[PDB]
Amino acid sequence: MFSRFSNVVSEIEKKYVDKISISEIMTKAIEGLLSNLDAHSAYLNEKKFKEFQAGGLGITVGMRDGVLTVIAPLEGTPAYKAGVKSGDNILKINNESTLSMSIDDAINLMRGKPKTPIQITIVRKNEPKPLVFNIIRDIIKLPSVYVKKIKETPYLYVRVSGFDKNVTKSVLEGLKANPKAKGIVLDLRGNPGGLLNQAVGLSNLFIKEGVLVSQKGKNKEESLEYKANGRAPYTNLPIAVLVNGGSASASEIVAGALQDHKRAVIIGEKTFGKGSVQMLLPVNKDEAIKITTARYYLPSGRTIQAKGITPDIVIYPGKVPENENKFSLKEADLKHHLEEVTPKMINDDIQLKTAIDSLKTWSIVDEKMD
Amino acid sequence: PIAVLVNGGSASASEIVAGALQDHKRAVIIGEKTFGKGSVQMLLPVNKDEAIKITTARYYLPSGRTIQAKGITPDIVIYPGKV
Numbered sequence: 001m002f003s004r005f006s007n008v009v010s011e012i013e014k015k016y017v018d019k020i021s022i023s024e025i026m027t028k029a030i031e032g033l034l035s036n037l038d039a040h041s042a043y044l045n046e047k048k049f050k051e052f053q054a055g056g057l058g059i060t061v062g063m064r065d066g067v068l069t070v071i072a073p074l075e076g077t078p079a080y081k082a083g084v085k086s087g088d089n090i091l092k093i094n095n096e097s098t099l100s101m102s103i104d105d106a107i108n109l110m111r112g113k114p115k116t117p118i119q120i121t122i123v124r125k126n127e128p129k130p131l132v133f134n135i136i137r138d139i140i141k142l143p144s145v146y147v148k149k150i151k152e153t154p155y156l157y158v159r160v161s162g163f164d165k166n167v168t169k170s171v172l173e174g175l176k177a178n179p180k181a182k183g184i185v186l187d188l189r190g191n192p193g194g195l196l197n198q199a200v201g202l203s204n205l206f207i208k209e210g211v212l213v214s215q216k217g218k219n220k221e222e223s224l225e226y227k228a229n230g231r232a233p234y235t236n237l238p239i240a241v242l243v244n245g246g247s248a249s250a251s252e253i254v255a256g257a258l259q260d261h262k263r264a265v266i267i268g269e270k271t272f273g274k275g276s277v278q279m280l281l282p283v284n285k286d287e288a289i290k291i292t293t294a295r296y297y298l299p300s301g302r303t304i305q306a307k308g309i310t311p312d313i314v315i316y317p318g319k320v321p322e323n324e325n326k327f328s329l330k331e332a333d334l335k336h337h338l339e340e341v342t343p344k345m346i347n348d349d350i351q352l353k354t355a356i357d358s359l360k361t362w363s364i365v366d367e368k369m370d
Numbered sequence: 371p372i373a374v375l376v377n378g379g380s381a382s383a384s385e386i387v388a389g390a391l392q393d394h395k396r397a398v399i400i401g402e403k404t405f406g407k408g409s410v411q412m413l414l415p416v417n418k419d420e421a422i423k424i425t426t427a428r429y430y431l432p433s434g435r436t437i438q439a440k441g442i443t444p445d446i447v448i449y450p451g452k453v
Contacts, residue, residue: 321451328378331406332439338409339439357446361398364445368395
């Protein structure tokens, strides 16, 4: 069928420097073909397929710009406490260099028996030196959601550290425990995602009608659409979502769905962009290939993968401007004049302050509309 | 939509506009608390080229609240700086 391929194979078999045979050429062609389709593919040889068939650090790893990068370390995990940050490019784990290693090979090296050491070396954009982290694995425990009242405001702070099997329940119970909230700061920053059922579940908690996210490939029969059920409470109350470069996968589905339905205002910075589904397909006889079979699409039809969520209000991290720098003059000092979220936390998060200020504007607009 | 910027130099007529928009919730007041002039001056000329300026009344916002010596507390406080 494909003659051009056979002519290329024959010439390298004829004129290449090293004595090479079909067995390597076909392997290098399969690895080369998959490497040029997408960055999430891998080919599993018979012996590496049976190796694949047979506690952690807390790093969610992905690939962007063709290199293995940390999406975000999970909140409260050993890696987060060790000081690895989002966007960190991993160059070495233990003995092996990662400049030509698969995502699953990195996950298999990082996860393992609890309380065992690992060494990883990363490169950053702020420092010239490579960083070496000696971190010990641990049992992954994470209270995925905590809810805090914001002091001197009616609003409520909802923190989702990661999408585990109980995020939607913990949110709904916290909103029932505060029936006078009148607003939510939904902080899913640094949240690399998790279970799709909780992204749809958490979004369906706020959206009354319409598509929440779609899964779509070439064959239009396999295409799935996740519609919201009519059982959505909290349909009117203001909600502001915080996202950053560590928000990915379920974190972008919840943010993108709320954004496309104009149900919330997205605050922060452009997200990571993880919106694809990979699948393992047994090929040949005892080999398998991993390839992307579908992509996630927002209600507006926009893709999440290479694009990510662009927030409606961009605010890079920093401290809020000084409480004042003025001994200024007022009429109150003129001659003969007629007469658990604390401010300490908000003043260090300009991103959090911007989110609260958007609820202050929302509640004013929905009060004008009397 | 209207977003009003006010600061410690906003006074008198500037606080009436900001205060009216605030009390009607017609606009969002953003910045920092204002000068707090809650009086109305009138000048009546005396000489051919000279005048006398007198505090003649106190002005009250649509909600009836006075601004004298207090100033407008904006809906969103921020203070100046670079982003």
